[PDB]
Amino acid sequence: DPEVAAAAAQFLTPVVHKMQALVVNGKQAHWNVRGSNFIAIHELLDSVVAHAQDYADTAAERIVALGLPIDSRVSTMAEKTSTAVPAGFAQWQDEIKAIVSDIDAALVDLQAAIDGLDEVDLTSQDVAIEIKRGVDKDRWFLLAHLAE
Amino acid sequence: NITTPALTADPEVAAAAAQFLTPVVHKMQALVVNGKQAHWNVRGSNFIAIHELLDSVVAHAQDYADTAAERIVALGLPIDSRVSTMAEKTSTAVPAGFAQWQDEIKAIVSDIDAALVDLQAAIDGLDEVDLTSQDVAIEIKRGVDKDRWFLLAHLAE
Amino acid sequence: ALTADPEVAAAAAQFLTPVVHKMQALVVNGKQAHWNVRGSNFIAIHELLDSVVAHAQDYADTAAERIVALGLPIDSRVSTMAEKTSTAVPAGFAQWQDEIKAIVSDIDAALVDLQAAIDGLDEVDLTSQDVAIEIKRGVDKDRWFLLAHLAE
Amino acid sequence: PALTADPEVAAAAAQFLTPVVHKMQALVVNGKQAHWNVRGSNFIAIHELLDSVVAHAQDYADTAAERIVALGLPIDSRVSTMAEKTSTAVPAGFAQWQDEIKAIVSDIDAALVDLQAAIDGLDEVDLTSQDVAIEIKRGVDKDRWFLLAHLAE
Amino acid sequence: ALTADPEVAAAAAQFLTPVVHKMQALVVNGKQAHWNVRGSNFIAIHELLDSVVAHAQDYADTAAERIVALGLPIDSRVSTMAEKTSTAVPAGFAQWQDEIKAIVSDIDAALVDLQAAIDGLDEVDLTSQDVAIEIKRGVDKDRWFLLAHLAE
Amino acid sequence: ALTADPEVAAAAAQFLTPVVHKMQALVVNGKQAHWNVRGSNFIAIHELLDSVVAHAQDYADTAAERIVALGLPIDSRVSTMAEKTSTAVPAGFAQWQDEIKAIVSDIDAALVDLQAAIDGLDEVDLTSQDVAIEIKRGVDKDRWFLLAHLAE
Amino acid sequence: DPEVAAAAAQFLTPVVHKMQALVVNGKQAHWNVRGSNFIAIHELLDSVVAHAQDYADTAAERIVALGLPIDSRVSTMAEKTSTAVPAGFAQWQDEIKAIVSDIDAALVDLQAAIDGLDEVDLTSQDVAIEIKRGVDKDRWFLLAHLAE
Amino acid sequence: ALTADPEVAAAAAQFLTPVVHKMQALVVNGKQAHWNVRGSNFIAIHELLDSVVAHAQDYADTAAERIVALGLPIDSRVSTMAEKTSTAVPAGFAQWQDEIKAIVSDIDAALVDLQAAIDGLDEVDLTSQDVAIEIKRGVDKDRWFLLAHLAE
Amino acid sequence: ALTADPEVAAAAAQFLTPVVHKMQALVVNGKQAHWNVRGSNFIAIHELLDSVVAHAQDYADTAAERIVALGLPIDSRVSTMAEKTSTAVPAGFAQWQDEIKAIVSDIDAALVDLQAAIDGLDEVDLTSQDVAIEIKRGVDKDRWFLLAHLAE
Amino acid sequence: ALTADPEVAAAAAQFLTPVVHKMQALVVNGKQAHWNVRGSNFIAIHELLDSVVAHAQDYADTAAERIVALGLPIDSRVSTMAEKTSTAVPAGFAQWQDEIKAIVSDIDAALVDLQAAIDGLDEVDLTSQDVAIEIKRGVDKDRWFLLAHLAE
Amino acid sequence: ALTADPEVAAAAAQFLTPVVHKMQALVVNGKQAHWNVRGSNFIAIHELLDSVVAHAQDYADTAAERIVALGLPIDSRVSTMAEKTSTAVPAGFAQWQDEIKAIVSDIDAALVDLQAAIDGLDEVDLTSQDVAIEIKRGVDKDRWFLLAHLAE
Amino acid sequence: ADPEVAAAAAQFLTPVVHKMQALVVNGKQAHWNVRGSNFIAIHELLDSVVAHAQDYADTAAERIVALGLPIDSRVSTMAEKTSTAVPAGFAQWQDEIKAIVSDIDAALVDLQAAIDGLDEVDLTSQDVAIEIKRGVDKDRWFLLAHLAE
Ligand SMILES: [Fe+3]
Ligand SMILES: [Fe+3]
Ligand SMILES: [Fe+3]
Ligand SMILES: [Fe+3]
Ligand SMILES: [Fe+3]
Ligand SMILES: [Fe+3]
Numbered sequence A, G: 001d002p003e004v005a006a007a008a009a010q011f012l013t014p015v016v017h018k019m020q021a022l023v024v025n026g027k028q029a030h031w032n033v034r035g036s037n038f039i040a041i042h043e044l045l046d047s048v049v050a051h052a053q054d055y056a057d058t059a060a061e062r063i064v065a066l067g068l069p070i071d072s073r074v075s076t077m078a079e080k081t082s083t084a085v086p087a088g089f090a091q092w093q094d095e096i097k098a099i100v101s102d103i104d105a106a107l108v109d110l111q112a113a114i115d116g117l118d119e120v121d122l123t124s125q126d127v128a129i130e131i132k133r134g135v136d137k138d139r140w141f142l143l144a145h146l147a148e
Numbered sequence B: 001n002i003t004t005p006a007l008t009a010d011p012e013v014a015a016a017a018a019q020f021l022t023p024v025v026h027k028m029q030a031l032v033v034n035g036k037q038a039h040w041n042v043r044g045s046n047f048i049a050i051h052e053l054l055d056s057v058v059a060h061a062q063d064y065a066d067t068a069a070e071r072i073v074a075l076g077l078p079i080d081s082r083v084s085t086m087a088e089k090t091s092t093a094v095p096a097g098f099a100q101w102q103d104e105i106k107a108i109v110s111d112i113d114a115a116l117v118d119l120q121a122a123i124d125g126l127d128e129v130d131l132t133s134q135d136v137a138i139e140i141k142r143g144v145d146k147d148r149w150f151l152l153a154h155l156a157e
Numbered sequence C, E, F, H, I, J, K: 001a002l003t004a005d006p007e008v009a010a011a012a013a014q015f016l017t018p019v020v021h022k023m024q025a026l027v028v029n030g031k032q033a034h035w036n037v038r039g040s041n042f043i044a045i046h047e048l049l050d051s052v053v054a055h056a057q058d059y060a061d062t063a064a065e066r067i068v069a070l071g072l073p074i075d076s077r078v079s080t081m082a083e084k085t086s087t088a089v090p091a092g093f094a095q096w097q098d099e100i101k102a103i104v105s106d107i108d109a110a111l112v113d114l115q116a117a118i119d120g121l122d123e124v125d126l127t128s129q130d131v132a133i134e135i136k137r138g139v140d141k142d143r144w145f146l147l148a149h150l151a152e
Numbered sequence D: 001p002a003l004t005a006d007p008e009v010a011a012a013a014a015q016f017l018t019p020v021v022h023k024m025q026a027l028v029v030n031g032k033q034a035h036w037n038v039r040g041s042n043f044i045a046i047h048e049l050l051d052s053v054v055a056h057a058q059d060y061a062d063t064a065a066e067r068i069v070a071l072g073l074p075i076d077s078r079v080s081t082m083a084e085k086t087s088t089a090v091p092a093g094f095a096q097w098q099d100e101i102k103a104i105v106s107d108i109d110a111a112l113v114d115l116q117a118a119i120d121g122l123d124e125v126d127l128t129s130q131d132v133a134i135e136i137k138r139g140v141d142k143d144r145w146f147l148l149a150h151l152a153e
Numbered sequence L: 001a002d003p004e005v006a007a008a009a010a011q012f013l014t015p016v017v018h019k020m021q022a023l024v025v026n027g028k029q030a031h032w033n034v035r036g037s038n039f040i041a042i043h044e045l046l047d048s049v050v051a052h053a054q055d056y057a058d059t060a061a062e063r064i065v066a067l068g069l070p071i072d073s074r075v076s077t078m079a080e081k082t083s084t085a086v087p088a089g090f091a092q093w094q095d096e097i098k099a100i101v102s103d104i105d106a107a108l109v110d111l112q113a114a115i116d117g118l119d120e121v122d123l124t125s126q127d128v129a130i131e132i133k134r135g136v137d138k139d140r141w142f143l144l145a146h147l148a149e
Helices: A003-032 A038-065 A074-079 A092-117 A122-147 B011-041 B047-074 B083-088 B101-126 B131-153 C005-038 C041-070 C079-083 C096-121 C125-149 D007-037 D043-072 D079-084 D097-122 D125-153 E008-038 E042-069 E077-083 E095-121 E126-150 F007-036 F042-070 F078-083 F097-123 F128-152 G002-033 G038-065 G074-081 G090-117 G122-146 H004-036 H041-069 H078-084 H096-121 H126-150 I006-036 I043-068 I079-082 I096-121 I126-150 J005-034 J043-069 J078-083 J094-120 J126-150 K008-035 K042-069 K078-084 K096-121 K128-145 L003-033 L037-068 L075-080 L092-120 L123-148
Strands: none
Touching: A003 A038, A003 A074, A003 A092, A003 B011, A003 B047, A003 B083, A038 A092, A038 A122, A038 B011, A038 C125, A038 E042, A038 H041, A038 H126, A074 B011, A074 B083, A074 J094, A122 C125, A122 D043, A122 D125, A122 E042, A122 I079, B011 B047, B011 B083, B011 B101, B011 B131, B011 J078, B047 B101, B047 B131, B047 C041, B047 C125, B047 H126, B047 K042, B101 B131, B131 H126, B131 K042, B131 L037, B131 L123, C005 C041, C005 C079, C005 C096, C005 C125, C005 F007, C005 F042, C041 C096, C041 C125, C041 D125, C041 F007, C041 K042, C041 K128, C079 F007, C079 F078, C096 C125, C125 D125, D007 D043, D007 D079, D007 D097, D007 D125, D007 E008, D007 E042, D007 E077, D007 H096, D043 D097, D043 D125, D043 E008, D043 F042, D043 G122, D043 K042, D079 E008, D079 E077, D079 L037, D097 D125, D125 F042, D125 H041, E008 E042, E008 E077, E008 E095, E008 E126, E042 E095, E042 E126, E042 H041, E042 H096, E095 E126, E095 J078, E126 G122, E126 H041, E126 I126, F007 F042, F007 F078, F007 F097, F007 F128, F042 F097, F042 F128, F042 G038, F042 K128, F097 F128, F128 J043, F128 J126, F128 K128, F128 L092, G002 G038, G002 G074, G002 G090, G002 J005, G002 J043, G002 J078, G038 G122, G038 I126, G038 J005, G074 J005, G074 J078, G090 G122, G122 I126, H004 H041, H004 H078, H004 H096, H004 H126, H004 I006, H004 I043, H004 I079, H041 H096, H041 H126, H041 I006, H041 L123, H078 I006, H078 I079, H096 H126, H126 L123, I006 I043, I006 I079, I006 I096, I006 I126, I043 I096, I043 I126, I043 J043, I043 L037, I043 L123, I079 K008, I096 I126, I096 J005, I126 J043, J005 J043, J005 J078, J005 J094, J005 J126, J043 J094, J043 J126, J043 L037, J078 K042, J094 J126, J126 L037, K008 K042, K008 K078, K008 K096, K008 K128, K008 L003, K008 L037, K008 L075, K042 K096, K042 K128, K042 L003, K078 L075, K096 K128, L003 L037, L003 L075, L003 L092, L037 L092, L037 L123, L092 L123
């Protein structure tokens, strides 16, 4: 099935882009974060970035194992992707809100992959589900700090 | 609130770190992304060894990007390596899709050679100004020099 | 055991039993390929085969223990496994390209049984279906690692 | 930054995974009771197997509960609540290893009924929470076999 | 089983049984606080609460096995634990300060039972008394790690 | 180019080849017993069989690699292994005592090939002899751990 | 003050001999045990032996650190010690009863040490108490098997 | 002598000796801050200080042993260390913000000495200079980890 | 602190504070002996002193934390530790016999403070006494490991 | 037994029994020397004696389990071991030179039984011979590490 | 040091000394090959050579320590090794097929010495013979991993 | 792309590869043949000097190759370029130490020339020589402190 492979690339490719973007912009947030929660938030952002890289890898290799290429060069990723992470120094609350905003957009792509792969490829569906479990948990670890 | 003591403060020294280490952060972080690209898309008779070597190049580039970034931040200056900025400052020969292992190694040596030029500029440019930052540039150059050899040794014949 | 509706257990045994057989066969024919492989890619491929064999052993265990957990026996004695299974791995020394092609061929027939399990367990037992999806994920990846070597 | 992102999915998780948390967390406490009080010819093997069923159950409780909380709804698993929502066949004092296994298997059978119900209820609603129920069911099914296999003769 | 100064066994049961119920309740109620905690200190307190629960589970096991090893049973079923124990941990989401104050409250009540075990075992069984001491040193330290956060 | 006794290697391959078939069959038939074992000693015997299987796989690997190191191929495909090998392990569920007797029976047959290799290799290749001696030391030990269970 | 060191030697020396003897006699039971429970009991006896060796060390090193020699040559140890462990093959139930009987006699010496050291050296009494905790738990793990 | 160059050795003692004292005093005063710290960031700051202390101990060792390797003694007795150093760390309980400022002040004093060492050793002994540069990289990072909390 | 006994906190501070000063001083002076030791046993004694310093550091921590857990602060600033403590460890290079003698001397003065804590906490707080017993067991053993070298 | 042979098992017991006794005795006598050793090489000899003890315990276990795997009991009760064995290790404190000489003397007596086993098993059971050779190889190395200290 | 029989020690030196010289040279020449290897298989062969080197270093050590344990010296100074040993490893960069051919030639020469040691120790000292047997197993296996690459 | 930089670096680091790789071999020699009252400690410390020396050899040789130049470190070249004071047979630990310290002293001469001469050529290769020199100076001290007596 050329269509099973076509459908994974269509649904999983946005996932590789946003997860690979989260690695880079996540490291930006980790470097520049300031303020009274520094060390916890600096470490937490490092763990989200490690997760993001593992997820980009799982999704990318699921596409490639099906026999289709992935274009995830820097130029392409920057084209398909954007970020609320500030350019410079920012308070820990602001870094959190910026990363949650990047995570929310990745969640919309994970859910679209989950619904889109239901009637086509349960194995590729399972990859988006496993990623969404981890990203939902990261989103909570981050956002619970602002709950009040 | 600016790192390094003895004299005050010094805005000069921080400003040189940012100037020479910033292109390093951007090229090393680009090499993480483009190296993963090469890692996913590589094909042909040397697949598993080159697939694995590229992962280890990426893991090094990521460490180097962090050490350079944190050295800039420790001196009290921000760093801009958002995806958008990094894309503007950086370019790759890694192909868009599948490619034979020889071609991937050439594309990645080309991107490493661009980083080397910026490391050698940092080493020269920091020599008169901040030996501690210079050491960061030196340490990353040794690792990058070795990764380059591991890549290039495959093409000797 | 139990009033634990007997048709769920029977569907796992029917769809996962071929996975146990072909995965356990892959352990043995993979060791064969690992011992007897030759040529310019020897070390990497000898290593990669050992890793496919380790995966195949784990997948066989996982599928078999799912059947037995649901209360049914499994026959994968050597004699049953040999009746139910066949291999393209050569008898003796062979070049790495040839070993890879033979292993990918065995992997391709296991993938057939994995997808039949996935499709067949969908309206019956989602827990057992997840065992097959998990194995299929790993097998698809092992197949790409092997097959990428022949890509030109 | 909303915190609960889909109230509907959140509610479905709370509805179907809350009994899973209660029974797994109760299984930690009553599994320990069986581990402490077990006697007879199979002591050391069963004492150790019960410890591993307890460690699983603690992880399953944690995974289930954090799935509900991540989605934005709280969980009440205080001791008083857990005790009102749960019961156990584990004996109050010393018991032979066969009776401990029967009692622990009866507790796991009631959790499998709640896991299957979660699997069924999450199917049209949230496949990501369904996957959490499916992962737990696989491990609990395995533990049930390990225990029950001792009684097969 | 087989000895057995019923006396020393009785003292252990009298004094360590409340320690088992309170430590085992702290595992359950500490997990409740770990799940539901919110606020600017979330990650550190979520993690510290896990570490308290891990300690409390080891202390319950040590105190319970000390009683059983001496030859008396322990009734630590959920229904009995719920009858013997009470918690201030809230039913839902709560700010990290409130979770700390609730958990320090539950720890303060265990400390009263730990001190009564240490005094009560003193003339009776120094080996059971050492169990109560070892537990109290860890609980005292956990109480400080929690309470230090509120010192201002 | 350059030396060696192809005679030595051929004689040695013929002594070790039976070892490889029986060891590799014991992996498959041991897993079979591991999955299907039942009764009052389940968890201990299930675990011990897993360790018997891991040793057998190491032994098959050590013997096969010895043969290949000497320059000779080895045919351990499933089809060949089934022709040369048989098992007393039952087709389905079996009481632990019977699983131990069946596995000991398979071990006993392997020990006949091992002893023949140790005796015959004494005059052929002391290096290959040492492989058989090491495999036999472990197998003699697994047999006692299994069998000591029926001593009463 | 010689009196502290003399009390330690006096009370801890029997503990060294009996723990050291339990290493040897427990190895004897570990090698020769037979029966339905072989593997569990074979492994449990190894674990008793490892504890016994650790305890004999800790007690001996306490005596020596206080300045006094210890004589636990084989010959001394055997004049001072006896065993119920059978000379050959024995069912697992009989090995357990013989090892528990050797443990019971070590318990009598441990309790005498705890009582004897109470008014004299609390630091050496802590050694006896820590060993008794461990031995009481080993005793239960053995005997629980015959509870029936 | 025990030399080498008398001059080179002397330069290293001269420039690295202050570095040994300030690092070794930071162990001691960092532990102080670690024990006595309070307030809403307690756990994270309590852990952070322990890691600064573990680094300062390592830096003290590295610098001292560089001096001794070159054949010169080092006097880092408590009494000497106390004459040659001073601390802003409070005597008792303090809020985490104040411990951070006290520690960063002790660190800025040490950075002054590290920089004079890097400047003074440039012409004389580049091996010892590298010791000071390695330490200064670590200490600069430790300073940032602390001071970042007050940027607020 | 707590809702109860001021005498418990005060006795712990009274008896364990000297122990913190002496153990923390032994970290500093032990490192001095470690760096400056010479002669035929260099490497064995260099290593042993590092292990003595690691223990002293852990003991200093355990005793300080016990005090703070009970609600009282501790002043182990360098300045204070210097006022309350002395050393026989020499200023520069010394033979290993004289480093062992100096370290033993510092350890004997610690043991006097530990035995005074043991005796003084006996009627006040058995949990705090247990801390002092545990440190004394370890320090007594370090003392023997060192002094046994001079039994020559 | 197997379908195999009783005069093999009898040989093993005959040649390996005195090994089990002497190695197990070296455990106890080795501990005795490790406790009581004094003088300028204390820590290095203390630690060396512990490693010899650890090897001796493993060697006893390997010899004993070989005998038992063959189907024969082993009597290594304290009383039997004490009967079959003697030591030159002193009752009390002794200089490290004397402890080395006493231990090497116990080792030489074991080497005599190890050599008789190697010669005696040569025509009877090459598998048990291999156990004797493996033990002798370790014992020969331990002896060298001890004796090298007295060479001058 | 010492030993029993001067003849045993003398045969060990005579037959194992050449093994020590060849293994030790293969560490040095193996490293040369590992530094200078080029071509399509660089990383696999670079890593494979490093593991051949690590094995050779261990075999050198084992053989040399066996000689010394029996009481005789070994002269393995660089000048001696160089007089006793030669290599076909090239001086400079070389393709991986050519590094493999050179290393395999150096191993072939060591295998001649090993087989001479095994034959020559057979009537003299089964313990030292077992050392040459174990080395020869490992080296025959390294030889295969190298040469398999050239089968095509 | 300056070939003279790499060649100059190779020329400074090559004697370091030879002397370090010889110390591996002659250190093993001392580690096997050492006797006397401090046997176990010195036998062990010599094994750690050897493990360091092998690392230093590797790091220096691989910097040369990374620069694109071959290194000739065959046994025959190493023996032509190197000498040792380690005795041929059994020797007391004090004599093994003096011989090894003498080999180290000759290596420090080469490390110091590399450090001085790489200062104007290649700071990255200089840094390799400084790192090896820091480790070797520590091993020198660990050995020699036993004779300070
Ligand atoms: Fe569906
Ligand atoms: Fe337990
Ligand atoms: Fe023979
Ligand atoms: Fe008292
Ligand atoms: Fe032989
Ligand atoms: Fe300069």
